[PDB]
Amino acid sequence: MRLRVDVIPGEHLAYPDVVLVVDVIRATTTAAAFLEAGAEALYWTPSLESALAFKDEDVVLAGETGGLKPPRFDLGNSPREALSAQVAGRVVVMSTTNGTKAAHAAARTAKHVLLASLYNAHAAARLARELATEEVAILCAGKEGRAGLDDLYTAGVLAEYLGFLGEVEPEDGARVALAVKRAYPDPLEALSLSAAALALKQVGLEADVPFCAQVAKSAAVPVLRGRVGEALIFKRA
């Protein structure tokens, strides 16, 4: 079973089998939290305006620009606020920056697209292995072409767990991700040292970092199951 980590997305990159998309602070952690709270589905849109379009339907609008909730949205991108929100049985539309680009990119060629985080890591890894036939790839969203220490650490936790579950053939990115995991046995340390955590502290949202540093506290795995208009439709596996 090949094990691959792409440290940043690339328009030209292709995925032959499974792809675990990671934006641990915060988009993919928030996505899992909404499904853990019972949301019927998550619609990930490619832009703020595209999410604003559902603003009339029976949905909850969640998202951020610069990490902060847009004035017309119901919720921001905090996974803590997502987990406690009244969304059971509801469709949540999410508009986030780095995370949606990565998912739309992987969705271009992958057979399966899963949204992974430290929060749902063991369940996400187990489903990836169950669905894979030749490769489990992990795509780290990073930020604007530069890799994130937090996403790579998460990819290292996933890579290590996948190795615990069965044999794996890693390539370079996966060896890099495992090295990042080995260097930070503490998930909260790896995440708190990251640029994404500092960005949240600069806008007063650092309380979200410990939530994102939780490991395997949810079995909710968003899986790409369809598309409507510009939205990718994720459902709980």
Next chain:
Amino acid sequence: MRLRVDVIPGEHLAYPDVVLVVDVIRATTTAAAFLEAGAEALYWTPSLESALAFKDEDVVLAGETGGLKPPRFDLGNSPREALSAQVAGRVVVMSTTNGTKAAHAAARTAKHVLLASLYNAHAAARLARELATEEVAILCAGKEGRAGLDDLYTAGVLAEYLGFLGEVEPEDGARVALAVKRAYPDPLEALSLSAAALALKQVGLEADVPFCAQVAKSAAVPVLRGRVGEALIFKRA
């Protein structure tokens, strides 16, 4: 001093101060070997075609596509062959797949561009610290949008040495590079597990890997000093 590592190049990425460009297997190692052999200058172009335009009496053309010497070139990209080449006092023109383009990307904005490898690591790190005033960035060439374990290990060796010289404030990429260095006590293991080493084995050029794994065997540091047409002009510092 800020310490930055970009795990892969990006067209829009900018560098405010010093950049150490790394393509350890093999372009930046080969660059240093040519200067160790006495070459007067290295002209790095961004394509085979542009390198060929510099053909002239006593000019040596070196390079590769798919790791192999192109038909019209004098030498390929082996650092062993570069070190033993008849290049004393001559201009060596090079075009390679990853490294020479990465240098052009950094040179668009950097104040200083140095070509770094394990082979000249300590001299390169010392020169970067001497020239820097606000930041030393290390640009890993990788391969076609994906990070290389070998370039990141090399960046970690450089990052560690820069830290011996004074205060460093690392960002995410630099912490990833240092984690890769810590994960591999033997530079030959990081390099021989890398996709770049396996790609050389596919075409029978793997004898160059041990050469690339030498640490601080040369004091020759190619430093950017000019540009003529499509060639970046590097001289021995």
